[model samples]
Target: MVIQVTNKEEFEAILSEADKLVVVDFFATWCGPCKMIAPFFEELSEEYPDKVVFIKVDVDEVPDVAAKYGITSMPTFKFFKNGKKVDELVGANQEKLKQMILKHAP
Candidate 1:
């Protein structure tokens, strides 16, 4: 399942706790692209399972976390490993998402 990060502390904890790649979807409620990619994200989460960690941050609920990551777009995807951000994707593209999962998943 995709974990929901509600606060900065929880977000930090998850980032530090995972050894594998942590994929976070930074999205807002009113974003149409975010809504469109939700199911694909969920499907990949289940497919990868323990191979990779999936997390979601709602920009509206946790503005600080979004700001921390410099999220200027509605559907930004950030890839983190060992508490450090290694890569990022700024839009909802299924093929790119799939490639990211394959490239990072351990």
Candidate 2:
């Protein structure tokens, strides 16, 4: 399930509950790279349905959340384990993203 986060409370709750690992993609609607990799993210989410909580946060829409996490780039992917950040990848690199997801999954 790819969750779209727009509220601070919901975001916080999700992080707290994602015990295994969580992948959050901070993206903007207008970014070309963000569009390119969105489908891949979805596909991976389906592949590893129970292993990760794949989520997307619109940086343009939710400026505060983006700012809170220092998401300066268009497609900033953050991997969280035990409700804490573990790895960060900026931009849309499909191979790198896949590796990162597998690295923390389960």
Candidate achieving the largest lDDT: 1
lDDT of 2 by residue, 3-101 (tens): 899977888898988776889999998899999999999999889978788989998888888988998898999988888899999999999999999
lDDT of 2 at 85: 96
Residue runs of model 1 more than 4 Å from their true location after superposition:
none
- Candidate 2 Cα errors over 4 Å, as ranges: none
Clashes per candidate (backbone, < 3 Å): 0, 0
Q: What are the TM-scores, per candidate, against the unseen true structure?
A: 0.96, 0.95
Lowest-scoring 10 consecutive residues by lDDT in candidate 2?
Answer: 12-21
Residue-wise C-alpha lDDT for candidate 1, range 6-94, written one tens digit per residue: 99999999999998899999999999999999999999989888788999999989999988889999799999988998888899998
Question: How many Å off is the CA of 44 in candidate 2?
Answer: 0.4
On a 0 to 1 TM-score scale, where does candidate 2 land against the true structure? 0.95
